[PDB]
Amino acid sequence: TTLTLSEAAPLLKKEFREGRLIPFLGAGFSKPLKLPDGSQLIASLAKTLGFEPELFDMHGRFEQLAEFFAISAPNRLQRLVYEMSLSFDSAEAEALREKSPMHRALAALDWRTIYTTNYDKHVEGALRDAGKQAAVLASFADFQGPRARDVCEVIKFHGTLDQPDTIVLTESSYFQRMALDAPPDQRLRADLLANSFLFIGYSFSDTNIRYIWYRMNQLREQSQLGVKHSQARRCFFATHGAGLVQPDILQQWNIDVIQLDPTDKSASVARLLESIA
Amino acid sequence: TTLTLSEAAPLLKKEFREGRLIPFLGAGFSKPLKLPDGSQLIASLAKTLGFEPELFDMHGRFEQLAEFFAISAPNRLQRLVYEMSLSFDSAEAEALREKSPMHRALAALDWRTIYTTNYDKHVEGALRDAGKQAAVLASFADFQGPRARDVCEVIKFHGTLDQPDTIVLTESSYFQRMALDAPPDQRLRADLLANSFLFIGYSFSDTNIRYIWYRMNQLREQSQLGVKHSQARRCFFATHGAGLVQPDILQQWNIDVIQLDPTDKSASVARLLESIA
Amino acid sequence: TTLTLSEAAPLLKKEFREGRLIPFLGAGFSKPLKLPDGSQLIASLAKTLGFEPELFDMHGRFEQLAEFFAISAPNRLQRLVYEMSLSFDSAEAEALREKSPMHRALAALDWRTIYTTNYDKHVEGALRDAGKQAAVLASFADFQGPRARDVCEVIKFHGTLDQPDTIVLTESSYFQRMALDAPPDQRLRADLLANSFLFIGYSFSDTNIRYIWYRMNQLREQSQLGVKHSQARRCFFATHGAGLVQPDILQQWNIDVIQLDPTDKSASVARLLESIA
Amino acid sequence: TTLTLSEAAPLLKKEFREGRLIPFLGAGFSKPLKLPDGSQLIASLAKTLGFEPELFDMHGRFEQLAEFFAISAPNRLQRLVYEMSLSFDSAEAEALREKSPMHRALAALDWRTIYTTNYDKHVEGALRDAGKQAAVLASFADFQGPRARDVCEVIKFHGTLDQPDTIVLTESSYFQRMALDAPPDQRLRADLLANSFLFIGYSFSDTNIRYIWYRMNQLREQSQLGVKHSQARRCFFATHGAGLVQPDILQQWNIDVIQLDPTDKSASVARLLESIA
Amino acid sequence: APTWFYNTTNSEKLRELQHVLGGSAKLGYLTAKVTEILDVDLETVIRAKAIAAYRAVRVPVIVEHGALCIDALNGLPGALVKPFWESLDTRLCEVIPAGQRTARARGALCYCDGRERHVLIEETEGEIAPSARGTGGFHWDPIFIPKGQTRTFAEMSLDEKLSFSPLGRLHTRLRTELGL
Amino acid sequence: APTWFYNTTNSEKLRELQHVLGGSAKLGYLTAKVTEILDVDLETVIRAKAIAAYRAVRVPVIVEHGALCIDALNGLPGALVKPFWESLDTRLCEVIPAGQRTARARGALCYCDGRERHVLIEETEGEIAPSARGTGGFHWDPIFIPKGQTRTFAEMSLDEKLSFSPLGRLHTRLRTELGL
Amino acid sequence: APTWFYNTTNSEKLRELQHVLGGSAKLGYLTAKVTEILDVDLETVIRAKAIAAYRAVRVPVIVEHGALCIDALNGLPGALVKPFWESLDTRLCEVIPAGQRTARARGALCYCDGRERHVLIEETEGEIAPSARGTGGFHWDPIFIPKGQTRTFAEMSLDEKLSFSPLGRLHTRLRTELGL
Amino acid sequence: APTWFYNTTNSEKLRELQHVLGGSAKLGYLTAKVTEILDVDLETVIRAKAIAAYRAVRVPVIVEHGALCIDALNGLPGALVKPFWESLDTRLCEVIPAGQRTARARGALCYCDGRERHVLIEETEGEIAPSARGTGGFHWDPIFIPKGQTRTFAEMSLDEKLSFSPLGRLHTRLRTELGL
């Protein structure tokens, strides 16, 4: 009940040749760029509040500690977003992206729509390193603005660092997005009617991407309510460790799991994106 | 507070040149085709139930009489849809459409997306008379199916006569669509984030299109909730009689009313579509 | 498919003896009080805007004309609510209510919950003329406030005249209430799980009460989604003219129609409420 | 920012004397009954699937392992519910409940409504050991059924073991309940308009009760949308370890944290319920 | 309970109805105000009046309309009872030419149960009168004289008029078709 | 663009209008079908016809109605132009008594911009004719003779009639109040 | 109410604590089970044990750990009190070489209020014993002999041991820093 | 594609593995960092290390752990390879008493495919050495001497050691049970 690299490649070619494949890229896609990971982001700013960094981490998850940090002082969460915009969107991560085999294999394919859940600019900047044009879509003013027709639309599902009022980082903002009323959510409601999705760079214990996987399947079955039940397109999830229980759960959420080789994790995702071509 | 033909034309050119104008076509757009109008559709089938046609009309509106006709016999509403498919999609209405100046002025513009609320095939057939390709999108199986990229997508907001399980004709089916959970509604939620709408062929006393006008404005203001309030694009409604109260109401629903010349109603809509070019 | 007075009385006794009958009272329940009816409410205030009263009525329905009147001047809709509070809640309507046989037959029964859609105070004042205590529930501050246990809770579904920010009178406020997010709507979502409803004083062409009838049936079938389908309680609608199509529609909305004698409309509703005892 | 036992007692008396206090009881309320806790429930049934119990636990959380167990065989999740109904509702847990000081201090107060999230019958059985009558409300057929007026209504928010189609135990059933469309959710939407809540027996890392705490606050602020903002009632959460970050988060969700003495956890909750009297 | 509900707004037509069909247990009486349809043809007015009455009351309803057709005026009033009566109460004995002096009095019932309509039409003619004579009647009864009589409608008693008038024979026919 | 839109359904009334106000740049013409209100009083009909026309077209509209009032019939037709014309085309020269032979011809315009109504009423009387004479006119022009003339409306030319008819002086007054 | 909650799982360490700080009104006692961190360095174990205890109880907590460092084994046990005690109860008097026979006994407290940690470390050394002598103690008290004494820890009374042991001087220092 | 993925973090253990099972087409190699479980019993450590490795990589994984059990110390180190090596690199030839001088070297593999675990245990004993002799080995190979030999582990070549060491016979048994 788990695909390999070689038997997922003719299934991902067919969805790409007819323009119906959308990558949905997570935080493990930004792993070769050597970015901070929240274990030293707000644990470093915990010394401003007055804690020890190993002891601030003790009181909850990162989204809960960020909610405490936002209700502490007026204009305090913007200290973290400006610190993330200098660490994630730094010139050292620009130079690693230009040599990264995943970001080259992603940008060598003519995509129409890319979703990503991470706040850095390295999916758009990957397309612009290959000489292609990308349109960043985070806010209502971005959807309203003018574009061309051929341009790949990069949808920032949890916001951009240069528009800090779009960031989904507080636990309350994660809870607010489960209603699916944000502008990236309204775009997702129409894209799931027509497209297949390729999820890259998530864990099985993420619990935000598992809700989206449940809720996409529910909106896809609610779509064909009055009409007869027709066989829909299949979504995909590329992993380096699949295991023995979680691939069987995602089958009822219209998701096939692709087992990639865990010996070199960045090379195996690069071989998956190069077989779509 | 009401535009003329000449001062709405540079405002509709600007939305069309950047590909952000969507026609939303009603039942008055199908008026030159000399189709039946429900005063003799189910009043003719009322003699099967046993009524007089002037007396069946007495007991409610057409959507309510169609709900009674659907709960009367098993497989009875499909008698009406097959009768509508022979009267609306008839060869006499095909020949009037090929000579109609509105259907030629609509098809001479390279549209990306056309919404329509009427069940006949005369918006797609207008584009195919001009040698252009159209894609009919009514059900989930239509959104999932393959298309090209340049093809104008004709969205049937209340269904097609050749797919009778998509028709919105019973009062209960009008009430069910106010939740905006159907596949044409999920597509509309994403199109209102980016586009202007040109409403042609409705009355001010329709009360289904007034709910959509309210609900599009609410979803557009819910879209820019967390971000600062930015000025959105303007929707348009072309009418041959505007009056003195209804243009001021639609201003709070992001709709400007265009007053067209009522002396020849089909020629004036044709001059509006020819000034967009 | 229509009950009489005598064969609806043992069915309304059984729902009342076990405390599961809720009256849902409309505008025809306030007809013996000789109140204005909107044909001379805002047509009288139309001379302030500058219209003739027969010509202001020409431009739309009353909820649409009230929306125009609200967007005309700042603090202008409060002129109408203060004029309605002096005409509907007047001392002449107090004295007719004390002699009214419907308001005496309503107040002689120990109710737990009364819903009403009209803004006047004559359902609470009827209970207080019989020496009973009533609690008016319109806003969030009314639900939060303290009550006793035995007191009948009168729920003002469209607001009270002494709290003008609760009035549902503009078309946009009717459209906003179709989401069922107001505090009287959240109370209705829990009361429809357990109770039967007796609708008195509505027309079949109201189109706001028809949506509530559709939406109560949908929430009652959504309630028993995962469990097996059990036979629910029956709602009732007392009318003086039932007709030949509308009783068959309301059967699919869990509503039985009671035909009352149209020779004296106020006496026949009084005989219905006196047979519940 | 954290109450003690002695300064939460006059605040819980005032909400109880006016009948506006509702206990919302969790799994730590059933801790003195020595019940299994899921570490040996489905790890014991994992030998039927063929795993080792320490290795079945490795592949996900308990709600995810229960979803795998439900999709394994037809009529397989009912093996677990019948095993839970013999372990949780056993005669040894009946005899511990009759000697438990929390279940006696809960039942000695005349409550109107008790919510609980655990599937065992030990909140109703506690009231019946004190000679009081309780009504179990889990399904639509329970809300429709007849009751008396004085009887405390025990609302089973995640189902009862003797009605297995009401159990919320699969991850997909937890995700389905976040829409708040179930009959215990529709009752909660109306109870939060009027009442204070006393949460006993939860952890700060539960993430299902944190969503309900977010979503109750959102529905309480959506309630007072059009009217002016009035100060609502306060909810409470009794804990034996509060910590230093989580009490400040719950303050923005209208929840005050009560710090109880952790030396004897069952005695301290018993002293809290005995000070409400 | 009543099944059929007669609708009327003229109180003198109501008294003549209840003189005949007043003892019927299954006929109710309503006084709903409907907008009167104006046309010369009686068949057209009474058939359109039953829809306007059923929209008002939504019970099985019976309506009624009268007509006077003057041979010296080529119809006229016909079923235009309202606009001539509002201006020419009984002056039609004078605006008629004195030569021909011959007219027809017509009445019509219509009962609609929501599905079907049924129209009953009865007709009586004698002549028109030179002078308004008599008191008890409605709308043109003082100036109408049937054949074989020298005594007008309004000069007769209530039992004498219903043996001659159109509305007296319609109420007998209405009984045997609806039971009543 | 036109500002005011004259509404009419009779094609002969349209030709006489465009003979006078045809060169006006700001008057459009519509032919929307409205339900005709029947009453004897002209002021009441023309004031209610403008609402029924504004509901049909929802532009600033001008309507028109004519009336003939016969002194030997106490009004009658009045503004009931439709039900007499459908049955008594030109026979009113014969159903009139030959004694008095005196009538009044009236016309009325009404223009409604959605807020206000304004009614213009002009009146002309001479007598009625013994015999229908003339061809060019509409509805009673062959049988109407003004004062000081032996020649009827329909025996006159189009420029001769508008110097005498009510509708000829209304169109002059309509110009100077709306600009046109 | 107590403010600081001492956490322990060994019942003999609890008796020696309550002999000293038992009359303190603001010290509670918890017996939450925490996973013991294994390392040789005492400073590292006691600093990581306070986080594992605060995650269990989430009140201001005090923890404690002991260590024995033998100079003839280059540390060893150190803060590995658990895996040597599970296999070598008192046999360390025999697996030691009989030559050097010199060791150090160390104890450590750590109190964490959720923000900060503070570590108190006290140290005592005399030698190790040839034979297990004495009964009253915990984990290595029969085989430890301080300097200037011939009598072991477990051969002494409870008041004699706390004048010499590391844990006796830590509890005095814990009082004057937290009030207690 | 590989099916089983050997996990290791010591680079010298990796070189000795790939000397034997390097030509196997279906064995991959991972270097995921797992938290080492500390206990004296080898069966307990290797069985708990396979869960900590499967949580890290979630592929069918093979782990490995070694143990040295000294009869003059009653076990000790056992499977506590980490805390003795961090402080007593090769000094165990000196902290041992010079009398008995006898120990056992043990190794263990465990392969977990997500459902089941299987533990392979091999054991070798000769004595311990007076002095650290030899260079090529890992963790205690210079001071261990098997029976019938005067030459230590680290004084031998790589092919000589795998004929004697526990880890040399485990890799032969691992081949014939997983195919490889």
Q: How far apart are CA E105 and CA B215, in angstroms?
A: 60
Test mutation, G8, G34, G55, G59, chain D, max D CBs within 10 A: G59
Return the number of CB contacts < 8 Å for C and E: 26
Q: Are strands A113-116 and A21-25 parallel, antiparallel or unpaired?
A: parallel
Residues of chain E in contact with residue F76, where contact means CB-CB under 8 angstroms, are 84, 87-88, 95
Q: How far apart are CA G149 and CA G178, in angstroms?
A: 33
- Distance separating the N- and C-terminal Cα atoms of chain D: 25
CATH number of the domain enclosing F45 = 3.90.950.10
Strand partners, H68: H78, H105
- Distance separating the N- and C-terminal Cα atoms of chain A: 25
E76 touches chain F (CB under 8 A): yes
CB nearest to G51's CB, from A50, A51, A54: A54
Residue among D161, D166, D167 at smallest CA distance from D125: D161
Q: Are F and B close enough to touch, i.e. 3+ CB pairs under 8 angstroms?
A: yes
Residue among B10, B25, B3 at smallest CA distance from B277: B10
DSSP code for B59: G
**In this complex, do H29 and A243 lie within 8 Å of one another by their Cβ atoms?**
no
Helix (H) / strand (E) containing D217: helix D209-223
Test mutation, H37, H49, H51, chain D, max D CBs within 10 A: H51
How many residues belong to chain G? 180
Question: Is D35 buried (19+), middle (13-18) or exposed (0-12) by CB count in 10 A?
Answer: buried
Residues of chain H in contact with residue G84, where contact means CB-CB under 8 angstroms, are 76
Residue among C152, C116, C155 at smallest CA distance from C134: C152
State whether residue D155 is helix, strand or coil. Answer: strand
Question: Is F98 buried (19+), middle (13-18) or exposed (0-12) by CB count in 10 A?
Answer: exposed
Q: How far apart are CA A80 and CA A169, in angstroms?
A: 10
In this structure, is the dihedral angle defined by the CA atoms of residues C116, C117, C121 and C126, taken in order, positive or negative?
negative
Whether C134 contacts C106, CB under 8 Å? no
CA H141: distance to chain centroid?
11
> What tokens does B76 get?
């009875």
DSSP code for E120: E
Whether G130 contacts G94, CB under 8 Å? no
CB nearest to A243's CB, from D59, D71, D243: D59
Return the number of CB contacts < 8 Å for A and D: 60
- Burial letters for D47-65: b for 16+ Cβ neighbours within 10 Å, e otherwise? eebebbeebbbbbbebbbb
Please report, for residues B183, E107, E122, E168, E178, the alpha-carbon distance to residue E173 in angstroms, rounded to integers and kept in the order given.
Answer: 60, 12, 10, 9, 9
Please report, for residues D100, D110, E53, the alpha-carbon distance to residue D127 in angstroms, rounded to integers and kept in the order given.
Answer: 12, 10, 62
Residues of chain E in contact with residue F69, where contact means CB-CB under 8 angstroms, are none
> What tokens does C107 get?
């107040």
DSSP code for C163: B
Q: How far apart are CA B34 and CA H140, in angstroms?
A: 99
Query: If you search the block for the tokens 């357990």, which residue do you land on?
Result: C194
Whether F167 contacts F64, CB under 8 Å? yes
How many residues belong to chain B? 277
Residues of C with CB under 8 A from a CB of D: 18-20, 139-141, 143-144, 146, 149, 163, 165-166, 181-183, 186-187, 189-191, 193-194, 219-220, 222-228, 230, 232-233
How many residues belong to chain C? 277
Q: How far apart are CA C96 and CA B75, in angstroms?
A: 53
Residue among A210, A257, A248 at smallest CA distance from D68: A248
How many domains are contained in chain G? 1
Strand partners, H141: none
Which amino acid, A185?
A: D
> F8 CA to chain B: closest CA distance, Å?
13
State whether residue H118 is helix, strand or coil. Answer: strand
- Distance separating the N- and C-terminal Cα atoms of chain C: 25
E115 touches chain B (CB under 8 A): yes
Q: What is the 3-state secondary structure (H, E, C) of C263-276?
A: CCHHHHHHHHHHHH
Residue among D249, D253, D248 at smallest CA distance from D235: D253
Residue among H10, H7, H9 at smallest CA distance from H53: H7
> What tokens does H47 get?
């069985």
Measured from the Cβ of residue B148, the count of other Cβ atoms closer than 10 Å reads 9
| Phi/psi at B37 (5° precision) | -130, 20
DSSP code for B232: P
User: Resolution limit in angstroms?
Assistant: 2.3
CA dihedral D177, D179, D181, D182 (to 10 degrees): 10
Please report, for residues B158, B241, B250, the alpha-carbon distance to residue B217 in angstroms, rounded to integers and kept in the order given.
Answer: 20, 23, 10
Measured from the Cβ of residue G126, the count of other Cβ atoms closer than 10 Å reads 17
State whether residue F75 is helix, strand or coil. Answer: strand
Q: How far apart are CA F98 and CA F6, in angstroms?
A: 39
Question: Is A136 buried (19+), middle (13-18) or exposed (0-12) by CB count in 10 A?
Answer: middle
Domain that holds residue G50: 4-178
Domains annotated for chain B, with CATH where assigned, are 9-33+100-276 (3.40.50.1220), 42-87 (no CATH)
How many residues belong to chain D? 277
| Helix pair angle (A183-191, B183-191), 10° resolution | 140
> What tokens does H169 get?
């016979």
Strand partners, A153: A113, A135
Measured from the Cβ of residue B17, the count of other Cβ atoms closer than 10 Å reads 11
Whether G73 contacts G80, CB under 8 Å? no
Whether A105 contacts A274, CB under 8 Å? yes
Q: How far apart are CA C159 and CA C147, in angstroms?
A: 19
Residues of chain B in contact with residue F57, where contact means CB-CB under 8 angstroms, are 240-241, 262
How many residues belong to chain F? 180
Helix (H) / strand (E) containing H93: helix H92-95
Residues of chain D in contact with residue G28, where contact means CB-CB under 8 angstroms, are 261-263
> What tokens does A129 get?
């390193």
DSSP code for B33: G
Test mutation, E59, E115, E117, E119, chain B, max B CBs within 10 A: E115
Strand partners, D253: none
Chains near A (3 or more Cβ pairs under 8 Å): B, D, G, H
State whether residue B249 is helix, strand or coil. Answer: helix
CB nearest to A60's CB, from D61, D178, D246: D246
**In this complex, do C249 and B211 lie within 8 Å of one another by their Cβ atoms?**
no
**In this complex, do A187 and B193 lie within 8 Å of one another by their Cβ atoms?**
yes
- Distance separating the N- and C-terminal Cα atoms of chain G: 12
Which amino acid, A270?
A: A
CA angle at C229 for the pair C226 and C232, rounded to the nearest 5°: 120
Q: What is the 3-state secondary structure (H, E, C) of C189-211?
A: HHHCCCCEEEEECCCCCCCCHHH
**Residues of chain H by 3-state class (helix, strand, coil), percent to 5:** 30, 25, 45
Question: Is H39 buried (19+), middle (13-18) or exposed (0-12) by CB count in 10 A?
Answer: middle
Please report, for residues B81, C194, D82, D93, D102, the alpha-carbon distance to residue D90 in angstroms, rounded to integers and kept in the order given.
Answer: 61, 31, 12, 5, 19
For this PDB entry, the determination method is cryo-EM
**In this complex, do B263 and F30 lie within 8 Å of one another by their Cβ atoms?**
yes
CA dihedral F90, F93, F95, F100 (to 10 degrees): 150
**In this complex, do A55 and G115 lie within 8 Å of one another by their Cβ atoms?**
yes
Question: Is A146 buried (19+), middle (13-18) or exposed (0-12) by CB count in 10 A?
Answer: exposed
> What tokens does C90 get?
């007047």
Q: How far apart are CA H61 and CA A138, in angstroms?
A: 42
Strand partners, C116: C25, C156
- Residues contacting residue H85 through CB under 8 Å, at least 6 positions apart: H139, H140
Q: How far apart are CA C200 and CA C116, in angstroms?
A: 10
Which amino acid, D174?
A: Y
Helix (H) / strand (E) containing H178: helix H166-178
- Residues contacting residue D227 through CB under 8 Å, at least 6 positions apart: C139, C140, C141, C163, C165, C166
Residues of chain H in contact with residue A4, where contact means CB-CB under 8 angstroms, are 1
Which amino acid, F7?
A: N
Helix count (H) and strand count (E) of chain E? 6, 7
| Phi/psi at E127 (5° precision) | 175, 180
| Phi/psi at B35 (5° precision) | -95, 160
What stretches of chain A show up as alpha helix (H) in DSSP?
9-17, 42-49, 53-56, 62-70, 77-87, 91-97, 101-107, 124-129, 140-144, 171-176, 183-191, 209-223, 246-250, 265-276
Q: How far apart are CA A99 and CA G108, in angstroms?
A: 51
Q: Are strands D134-137 and B196-200 parallel, antiparallel or unpaired?
A: unpaired
DSSP code for A45: H
State whether residue A193 is helix, strand or coil. Answer: coil
Q: How far apart are CA E106 and CA G30, in angstroms?
A: 107
How many residues belong to chain H? 180
> F55 CA to chain C: closest CA distance, Å?
7
Q: How far apart are CA E85 and CA E101, in angstroms?
A: 19
**In this complex, do F114 and B243 lie within 8 Å of one another by their Cβ atoms?**
yes
DSSP code for C164: G
> What tokens does E30 get?
């309503």
Q: How far apart are CA H43 and CA H110, in angstroms?
A: 10
**In this complex, do D52 and H117 lie within 8 Å of one another by their Cβ atoms?**
yes
Whether E144 contacts E167, CB under 8 Å? no
G29 touches chain D (CB under 8 A): yes
B261 → chain F, closest CA residue = F1
Q: How far apart are CA D187 and CA C18, in angstroms?
A: 20
**In this complex, do F2 and B241 lie within 8 Å of one another by their Cβ atoms?**
no
Which amino acid, B65?
A: L
State whether residue F46 is helix, strand or coil. Answer: helix
Q: How far apart are CA B146 and CA B148, in angstroms?
A: 7
E51 touches chain C (CB under 8 A): no
Residues of chain F in contact with residue C65, where contact means CB-CB under 8 angstroms, are none
- Residues contacting residue F47 through CB under 8 Å, at least 6 positions apart: F110, F117, F119
Q: How far apart are CA D34 and CA D40, in angstroms?
A: 13
Residue among D60, B159, B129 at smallest CA distance from A246: D60
Q: Is the peptide bond before H77 cis (omega within 30 degrees of 0)?
A: yes
CB nearest to D50's CB, from H54, H112, H115: H115
**In this complex, do E80 and F83 lie within 8 Å of one another by their Cβ atoms?**
yes
Question: Is D182 buried (19+), middle (13-18) or exposed (0-12) by CB count in 10 A?
Answer: buried
Q: How far apart are CA A200 and CA A202, in angstroms?
A: 6
Whether E113 contacts E58, CB under 8 Å? no
DSSP code for C260: P
Test mutation, D237, D245, D261, chain G, max G CBs within 10 A: D261
**In this complex, do D193 and C227 lie within 8 Å of one another by their Cβ atoms?**
no
**In this complex, do A191 and B189 lie within 8 Å of one another by their Cβ atoms?**
no
- Burial letters for A96-126: b for 16+ Cβ neighbours within 10 Å, e otherwise? ebeebbbbbbbbebebbbbbbbbbbbbbbbb
Query: If you search the block for the tokens 């006006």, which residue do you land on?
Result: F24
Residues of chain E in contact with residue C243, where contact means CB-CB under 8 angstroms, are 58, 114
> What tokens does A41 get?
């982001």
**In this complex, do D144 and C190 lie within 8 Å of one another by their Cβ atoms?**
no
> What tokens does C68 get?
């125009």
- Distance separating the N- and C-terminal Cα atoms of chain B: 25
Residue among H118, D84, D71 at smallest CA distance from A245: D71
DSSP code for E32: -
Which amino acid, G48?
A: A
What stretches of chain C show up as alpha helix (H) in DSSP?
9-17, 42-49, 53-56, 62-70, 77-87, 91-97, 101-107, 124-129, 140-144, 171-176, 183-191, 209-223, 246-250, 265-276
- Burial letters for E52-61: b for 16+ Cβ neighbours within 10 Å, e otherwise? bbbebbbbbb
Measured from the Cβ of residue F33, the count of other Cβ atoms closer than 10 Å reads 8
Residue among C13, C3, C10, C4 at smallest CA distance from C277: C13
Q: How far apart are CA B111 and CA G7, in angstroms?
A: 74
Q: How far apart are CA H4 and CA G178, in angstroms?
A: 56
> What tokens does E29 get?
């009486």
Q: How far apart are CA B169 and CA B157, in angstroms?
A: 12
Q: Is the peptide bond before B10 cis (omega within 30 degrees of 0)?
A: no
- Distance separating the N- and C-terminal Cα atoms of chain E: 12
